């Protein structure tokens, strides 16, 4: 399967681990064991913070996943114009009759 997991790719995530710690950052790479790779990571042990960088977690260590934010980031047809004119028709009445 893993169809849902590809959809998460390149989003800022909030990942709770078995220790209780919570890592945060974008998701670059993903596995069948749920090994996650995360970019520009920050733990929140708890009024606390730390800067790590690139972090590769195991599957054993991970508990839950949750998105913090969204993913980060016919030329010219034939037609031609002209000016005015607005000719008057001598005849009245509809197009087909006469």
């Amino acid at each position: 399967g893993t169809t849902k997991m590809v959809s998460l790719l390149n989003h800022s995530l909030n990942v709770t681990t078995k220790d209780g710690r919570t890592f945060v950052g974008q998701l670059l790479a993903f596995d069948g064991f749920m090994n996650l790779v995360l970019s520009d990571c920050q733990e929140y042990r708890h009024e606390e913070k730390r800067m790590l960088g690139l972090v590769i977690l195991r599957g054993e260590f991970i508990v839950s996943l949750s998105v913090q934010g969204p993913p980060p980031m016919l030329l010219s047809g034939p037609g031609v114009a002209r000016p005015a004119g607005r000719g008057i028709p001598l005849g009245q009445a509809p197009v087909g009759l006469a």
């Binding site: 016919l74 010219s76 034939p78 114009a81 009245q92 509809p94």
Partner: protein, 293 residues
């Protein structure tokens, strides 16, 4: 100026501005929607794919997505920024004739020759509702509220249906023949309607009687669906005719501007959302931007 731009190969039908007032779209029998600028009046994308002829455009109220109503059951959807296909809303078993859109660009209504009205979501690719009458339907309009949908058929009976109830609440009367285009005001308070009796009547939305029967805009053997519009103020009414003339009314029951220019039957007249301009289209393969100083 006036600006009579050429471009299409065959009979053009529908031409509309964005809600913003920065583009045209146009497309008829060509199987080609051709986008335009307003203020250096040049073409843009050739939206290609529809395997039936187009019968109705309508910009999404985001001014990005466009919706068609081909003669081969499809209702297409186009990214006007890029110009790629999004979907093919496959449903009806016949030729679609009209489209309508809401504020919320999400819901669409179409009208077949299967005698079936159908409401569409831009997320499902299927019908939300299916209202089967009996005789092939032709014109439809949805209110600003996102509640009342007006149907126009062959009986001369503009029926009114809500999205909650789905009951024949009311039926407009006194129109002897055929409806070619409904049109709700920018209030949500009154319709316009072209009959084959040439009585370009206005109706009420809430008591529900007539207001003013306008008379002087002929349909004949061609059997094209002719259009009507409300001006941005809702002062003027712009009805085209098969007499090559754009009969603009005063909405008080007075013909003010009657400007010719086309060499063939006229189809769908429109108005710009702010500055006084008139889009007028016609089998002829031509289009005008009639102004008032």
């Amino acid at each position: 100026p006036n600006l009579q731009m050429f471009g299409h190969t065959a009979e053009v039908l529908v031409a509309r501005f964005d809600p913003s007032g920065s583009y045209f779209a146009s497309g008829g029998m060509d199987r080609q929607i051709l986008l335009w600028n307003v203020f250096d009046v040049k073409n843009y994308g050739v939206l290609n794919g529809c395997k039936g002829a187009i019968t109705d455009l309508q910009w999404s109220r985001d001014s990005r997505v466009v919706y068609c109503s081909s003669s081969d059951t499809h209702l297409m959807s186009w990214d006007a920024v890029s110009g790629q296909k999004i979907r093919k809303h496959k449903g009806h078993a016949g030729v679609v004739n009209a489209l309508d859109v809401l504020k919320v660009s999400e819901l669409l209504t179409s009208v077949s020759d299967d005698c079936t009205m159908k409401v569409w979501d831009s997320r499902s690719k299927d019908c939300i509702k299916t209202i089967e009458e009996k005789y092939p339907l032709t014109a439809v309009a949805i209110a600003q509220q996102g509640t009342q949908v007006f149907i126009g058929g062959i009986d001369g009976a503009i029926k009114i249906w809500d999205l909650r109830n789905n009951h024949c609440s009311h039926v407009l009367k006194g129109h002897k023949d055929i409806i070619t285009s409904l049109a709700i005001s920018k209030d949500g308070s009154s319709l316009l309607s072209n009959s084959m009796d040439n009585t370009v009547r206005i109706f009420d939305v809430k008591a529900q009687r007539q207001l003013q029967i306008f008379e002087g805009a002929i349909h004949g053997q061609e059997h094209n669906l002719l259009g009507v519009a409300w001006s941005r103020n809702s002062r003027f009414v712009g009805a085209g005719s098969s007499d090559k003339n754009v009969y603009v009314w005063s909405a008080t029951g007075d013909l003010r501007y009657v400007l010719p220019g086309h060499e063939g039957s006229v189809n769908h007249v429109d108005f710009h959302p702010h500055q006084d301009i008139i889009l007028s289209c016609s089998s002829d393969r031509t289009i005008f931007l009639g102004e008032l100083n």
